[PDB]
Amino acid sequence: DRILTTRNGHTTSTTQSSVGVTYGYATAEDFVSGPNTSGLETRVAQAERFFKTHLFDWVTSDPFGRCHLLELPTDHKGVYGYLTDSYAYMRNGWDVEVTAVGNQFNGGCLLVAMVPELCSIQKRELYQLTLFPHQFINPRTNMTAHITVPFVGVNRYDQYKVHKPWTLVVMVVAPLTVNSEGAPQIKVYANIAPTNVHVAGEFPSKE
């Protein structure tokens, strides 16, 4: 009864322990045809695929609130990051997918959250990270969390060299409790993908 294998473009991602995809803040995209671009935008369909990245190593000595904040977009050394140095104005959504593979005998949990415009946080502020598009990961139930968000922003197209709208945040809510039969150290990976990018305005070539 379960369709649990996502794909974006020509790359797939099958997980067998998906509790469900959480659509944050919208189920559909905004009007991409703005009046601040005079109709000179175009969709690049070849930017929609996953790209893997490493986040941290959740070990047993990590207390509450060992958070990790990577700003999206990060250094993409493929097709998507070519558009950052070749087009000035661009917009996109994201559909992140973090993995924390241990086994079903570890304990603890780590919250995953896509949060816009995130800087200067407190550890007393971490108690209310649930407000954002979030999805828990505990090894007793699942291994992945699959969050999808649209383009938010102050204005319709963005300059990603001077601005980073989203921030993938993973923090640890309960510490990793290994047992006699669990896994000692788990490593948190993530494959991130854009959704329906739209560039506008060609830079001159660097030559």
């Binding site: 803040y25 919208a26 009007f31 703005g34 009046p35």
Partner: protein, 45 residues
């Protein structure tokens, strides 16, 4: 409508009072109304 309490019409029209909004061509009320309730298994009385 806000924190207005007047039944009379405004004196200044609509565009010397506010800034007019422009269409081009909500969420958490739909999110809080799709909340699951009841139980998960076969209940008794």
């Amino acid at each position: 409508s806000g924190n207005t309490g007047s039944i009379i019409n405004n004196y200044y029209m609509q565009q010397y009072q506010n800034s007019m909004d422009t269409q081009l061509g909500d969420w958490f009320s739909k999110l809080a109304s799709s909340a699951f309730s009841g139980l998960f298994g076969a209940l008794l009385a």
